[model samples]
Target: HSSGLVPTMKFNGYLRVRIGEAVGLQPTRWSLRHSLFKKGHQLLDPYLTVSVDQVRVGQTSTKQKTNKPTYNEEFCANVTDGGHLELAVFHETPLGYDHFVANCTLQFQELLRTTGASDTFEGWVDLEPEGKVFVVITLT
Candidate 1:
């Protein structure tokens, strides 16, 4: 018998995830300010980053000038533990770095709960602070 000091070597494997559209999102402060006069074109270019266990694995392509962005993007991440999943959405700025918009996070088991033994989930998750995002997850 051994002491419990040693960490378990149970790897949770990988996850196949899709980052779909985000709806009901509002434009950022800068975007609103810019569009005040130039109403012809808006300024909320959006993109998303996917993270597993707090580590960024991949990101989606930027969708230009819209509050509702349809990013039908997919990513596969090798999970170290029964990791947490984060979908962080950002707005691309004209003169500076991308600005934070909203985010949604879920425990790996949440997907499992929805997916069951079939291991597939297609649903919408409420974003932190505001809005919601559609996603599809599969435990592969």
Candidate 2:
């Protein structure tokens, strides 16, 4: 969805990875980023989502000899006027290994339209796992 009056605005989208795979059998974290705009592609509002996924038994281990385990990640965002966006990541685990799943949602207050370019959005896997994780934009 979008904010402000006068439809036909332009906006841009992007995702930032706050965290990446754990280093040594630890947990992982990430974040999602989004930007809104009004007619003529003017900036309107910005949003973010923070997330964290637990460690899988078969995934990364304290020992460096083994490889990282597998898990699943999903994300969804909504903007009042922008629209809805969702993302998913699946990690296949080996036989006898546990799995993980992650998901999130975001919503924008004011709805508007994009002016310039159609709209560009991107998502990334953050390698960090300490502070804020991810952000998800939502539309209602």
Candidate 3:
């Protein structure tokens, strides 16, 4: 029993995380990743560094040990509806800090084109000239 002309309450919707994963990424600095370029056969340790408009949002990194990196991490952000989001995936080295591996980015239009929020915007990381490093993303 409400008026049809009543204004609907439009609140700020948080961008939820559906899911994300990367596959077949060529380890750039393969010094620790099994030393495949040298000796033993071991796995790689990679993680994700998410951000918005240059601001570092979050990086899902842990004791990763594998060639195909997959971070089933959960993250939520309210980046003003539609905005540029970047994902910098890196590999951790025991020697010191993390090393650069690949980078993936998505724009605002790609995030707001699927009506509500059940859209999956997938893209590849700009690395390996001959096609190697890559990743897929799903935003909510």
Tell me how candidate 2 scores on lDDT: 0.26
The reply for model 1, stretches above 4 Å from the true place, is 1-11, 30-43
Best by TM-score: 1
TM-score of each: 0.80, 0.22, 0.63
lDDT of 2 at 83: 29
Indicate the TM-score of model 2. 0.22
Residue 108 accuracy (lDDT) in model 2? 17
**Per-residue alpha-carbon lDDT of candidate 2 for residues 17-129, written as tens digits (9 for 90 to 100):** 22233212222221111111122332111122243222111211122222232222334322222322322222222234222223332221111232123232223333222
Error of 2 at 35 (Å): 38
Q: Rate the local accuracy (lDDT) of all candidates.
A: 0.79, 0.26, 0.57
> Ten-residue segment with the worst summed lDDT in candidate 1?
28-37
Q: How far is candidate 2 from the true structure (C-alpha RMSD, Å)?
A: 17.2
How large an RMSD does model 1 have? 3.6
- Candidate 1 residue lDDT tens string, 10-109: 3397789987888877666665675423677654678989988678988998888777899888999777766578889888766667778888888877
Which one is best on lDDT? 1
